[PDB]
């Protein structure tokens, strides 16, 4: 019970009615259900077509271009639950271009567990606005219902009750009625039970039901199982000895084992070697697990455990990265590989990531017209070619037209065995016979090769596999240039030497194996050690250099030549560049902070920064000029864009390439910020800054980077000190004496005196330094007699000072 019919897998029914009858009996589809591309079908064909026993769908339901279909109310009357275990592009119900379809009709569809619904381009579909997706879908924000007949209002969606007062089933959110067809309306359960389902009477179903049930509160009288299905009863979890299967039913070990048995050999495409783990008949053991053949359990494996991968007819072509992504992690390959990589970006390392785990190849390994492959080191773990599947001519290794191939495997560090078959190397210009013969010795295939199987005149050609050695003799460098010499190597026939070839590059790290290189050609010595003089090297840089000879293949035995070992030579250090971005900021009367960044060209390691600061005296003109004269200034010290960008950057670069060839100072060590001490208040300071990479042994380093700053002035440094003495002689001539602010902010530009008779108005008057020095102060005149007031304010470079306390004087009448 609980599922009267059988269970069917998924199907792709197309182009004919002769396959829809496959759902005659089964009540559950263990997969998806696609009915699409129905061109010749007529509406008369669906009148007598129904599958009332269909209840449950695991993956999804899809309809696309089915001509003549009008509604699914007759197709799947009892379709209840769509689990959505596997979604069609995040959609559990796709109805796309369902021409002639008028209404959905799936009135028994209570729940869609996972995914959303995509309904589109349905110019005849009605009854879409009167459906409650919130009561069916847990989250409806992923839906897609557009371009239907309900977009532009043309559907008369009327369902039973409207003539009687929209009765026979309620409405909810506007409070529009929710209903499926013109004769069947949606059944909505009360919120007292979330999704357990309820009968038509109103009483809720059992917790293990889903949507509908015949008897309330009965796990054996449901219609769908919320968690799992067993023996016609819905259960929370599968009890032993039954395992969870497909996340919807419980099966015994026998069923999973038998399914795996049919998947071993008697199914070529699409089967899953089902395994038992966590009491679940999972299709495949997860990562870090292996299958124990005794009971198919996913017993944990220590370290990298085998991941055998099968191949379509055991022959896979890998012409790019994407084909290699499939074979990721395959320790053992039960097939054969075809390598036809004609190019790629950042290969032999990412390719190593994809294909570096293969340890076994059942068939043959083939490399054909692989333009980009420079070496087979990406087969990091390959150790045995079984050679049970072979090509025509019985070939296990088949290398052909490999233009850039230079090295198969480092036989000093690699092992390889080939059980059956013979090698084949043709048209491998950059790979000489030494590597092939070494592989023949290593793999034990020496006794299998016959005539013309190995090409003796198309392989070891343009190959750089010099057997002898070149020893560098004289090497001494400079800050910009490096001189090199080596022993004069002469082949047995001195006419055979075309010259020498020198390779160098910037190699900060010594992990260079010559497998990008500036090449220099050198004429042979005139029968006097040959060498070259590098000219454009950056200072304090590590250069990897080796020397390879250039000989000619003689008609007699080939002279291989000699190549030097890869040596690393470091250029000398020189004067560093200007320390870029020097900024000085004053935050105190004696403290100024100096900040800078390391130079763009250290030309070594910056041992210490050298900082010079020199006091700048104030301008001479500030001492002998009157600043209250008519006309005065107060000395208050403190593709269009691309074209400009490139021109300005070139302008900056132009000058940057030009500069390449007793005062208080200090040496800043390993710091780029500095604060000076013991500075006079409000004094412009000239800071000369230098980066330096050597201190004691005849120090030589960069040119000065200049910046200037002025310290913060004191608030009360400009205050007037001493009494404001007044004096008269006879005729109301005021003679004001007052002491200077001996320590001002820079200097005192001028003084101003404000005087006002008792009850009268105030008049302003300036005092200049020349006037102040000559008159020892100020000498007022031409003012009325009586009692007055005197207020004095001192003006410095920082600004106006604080007015002194007012002083009164009374003159003789």
């Amino acid at each position: 019970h609980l599922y009267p019919g059988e269970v069917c897998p998924g199907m792709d029914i197309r182009n004919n009615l002769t396959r829809l009858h496959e759902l005659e009996n089964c009540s559950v589809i263990e997969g998806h259900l696609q009915i699409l591309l129905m061109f010749k079908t007529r509406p008369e064909d669906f009148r007598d077509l129904s599958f009332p026993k269909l209840i449950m769908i695991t993956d999804y339901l899809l309809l696309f271009r089915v001509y003549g279909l009008e509604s699914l109310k007759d197709l799947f009357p009892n379709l209840t639950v769509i689990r959505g275990s596997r979604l069609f592009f995040n959609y559990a119900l796709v109805i796309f271009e369902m021409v002639h379809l008028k209404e959905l009709g799936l009135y028994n569809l209570m729940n869609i567990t996972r995914g959303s619904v995509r309904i589109e381009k349905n110019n005849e579909l009605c009854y879409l606005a009167t459906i409650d997706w919130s009561r069916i879908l847990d989250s409806v924000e992923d839906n897609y219902i557009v371009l239907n007949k309900d977009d532009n209002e043309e559907c008369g969606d009327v369902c039973p009750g409207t003539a009687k007062g929209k009765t026979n089933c309620p409405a909810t959110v506007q409070f529009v009625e929710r209903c499926w067809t013109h004769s069947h309306c949606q059944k909505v359960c009360p919120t007292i039970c979330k999704s357990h389902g309820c009968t038509a009477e109103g009483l809720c179903c059992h917790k293990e039901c889903l949507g509908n049930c015949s008897e309330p509160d009965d796990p054996t009288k449901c219609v769908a199982c919320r968690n799992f299905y067993l023996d016609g009863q819905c259960v929370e979890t599968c009890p032993p000895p039954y395992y969870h299967f497909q996340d919807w039913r419980c099966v015994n070990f026998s069923f999973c084992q038998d399914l795996h048995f049919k998947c071993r050999n008697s199914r070529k495409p699409g089967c899953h070697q089902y395994v038992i783990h966590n009491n679940k008949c999972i299709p495949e053991c997860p990562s870090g697990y292996t299958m124990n053949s005794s009971n198919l359990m996913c017993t944990p494996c220590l370290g990298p455990c085998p991941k055998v991968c099968q191949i379509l007819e055991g022959e896979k072509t890998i012409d790019s990265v994407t084909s290699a992504q499939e074979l990721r992690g395959c320790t053992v390959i039960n097939g054969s590989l075809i390598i036809n990589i004609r190019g790629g970006n950042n290969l032999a390392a990412e390719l190593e990531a994809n294909l570096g785990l293969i340890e076994e190849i059942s068939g043959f390994l083939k490399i054909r017209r692989s333009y980009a492959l420079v070496s087979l080191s990406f087969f990091r773990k390959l150790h045995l070619i079984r050679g049970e599947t072979l090509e025509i001519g019985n070939y296990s290794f088949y290398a052909l037209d490999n233009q850039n191939l230079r090295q198969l495997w480092d036989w000093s560090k690699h092992n390889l065995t080939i059980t059956q078959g013979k090698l084949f190397f043709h048209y491998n210009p950059k790979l000489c016979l030494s590597e092939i013969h070494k592989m023949e010795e290593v793999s034990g295939t020496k006794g299998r090769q016959e005539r013309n199987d190995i090409a003796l005149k198309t392989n070891g050609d343009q190959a750089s596999c010099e057997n002898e050695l070149l020893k560098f003799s004289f090497i001494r460098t400079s800050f910009d240039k490096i001189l090199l010499r080596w022993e004069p190597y002469w082949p047995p026939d001195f006419r055979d030497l075309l010259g020498f070839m020198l390779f160098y590059k910037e190699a900060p790290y010594q992990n260079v194996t010559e497998f990008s290189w500036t090449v220099v050609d050198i004429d042979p010595p005139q029968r006097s050690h040959p060498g070259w003089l590098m000219r454009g090297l950056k200072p304090w840089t590590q250069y990897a250099i080796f020397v390879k000879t250039l000989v000619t293949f003689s008609d007699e035995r080939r002279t291989y030549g000699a190549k030097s070992d890869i040596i690393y030579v470091q250029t000398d250090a020189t004067n560093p560049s200007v320390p870029l971005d020097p900024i000085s900021v004053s935050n105190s009367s004696s403290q100024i902070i100096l900040k800078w960044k390391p130079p763009s060209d250290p030309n070594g390691n910056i041992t210490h920064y050298l900082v010079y600061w020199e006091r700048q005296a104030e301008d001479s003109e500030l001492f002998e000029l009157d600043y209250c004269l008519k006309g005065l200034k107060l000395p208050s010290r403190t593709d269009s864009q691309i074209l400009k960008e490139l021109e300005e950057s070139s302008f900056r670069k132009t000058f940057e390439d030009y500069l390449h060839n007793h005062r208080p100072f200090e040496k800043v060590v390993n710091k780029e910020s500095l604060v000076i001490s013991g500075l006079r208040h409000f004094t412009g300071y000239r800071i000369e800054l230098q980066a330096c990479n050597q201190d004691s042994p005849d120090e030589r380093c960069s040119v000065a980077a200049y910046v200037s700053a002025r310290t913060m002035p004191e608030a009360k440094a400009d205050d007037i000190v001493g009494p404001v003495t007044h004096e008269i002689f006879e005729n109301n001539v005021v003679h004001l004496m007052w002491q200077e602010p001996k320590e001002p902010n820079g200097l005192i530009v001028l003084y101003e005196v404000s005087y006002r008779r008792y009850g009268d108005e105030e008049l302003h008057l300036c005092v200049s330094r020349k006037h102040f020095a000559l008159e020892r102060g100020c000498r007022l005149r031409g003012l009325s007699p009586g009692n007055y007031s005197v207020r004095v304010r001192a003006t410095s470079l920082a600004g106006n000072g604080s007015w002194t306390e007012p002083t009164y004087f009374y003159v003789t009448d």
């Binding site: 001494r476 400079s478 910009d480 240039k481 001189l483 003089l533 000219r535």
Partner: peptide
Amino acid sequence: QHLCGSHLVEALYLVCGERGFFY
């Protein structure tokens, strides 16, 4: 690359020196 000026004289100083150059 190209060498004449200070670069040329320092290049001659780098190549020779055990016996000396005149230029």
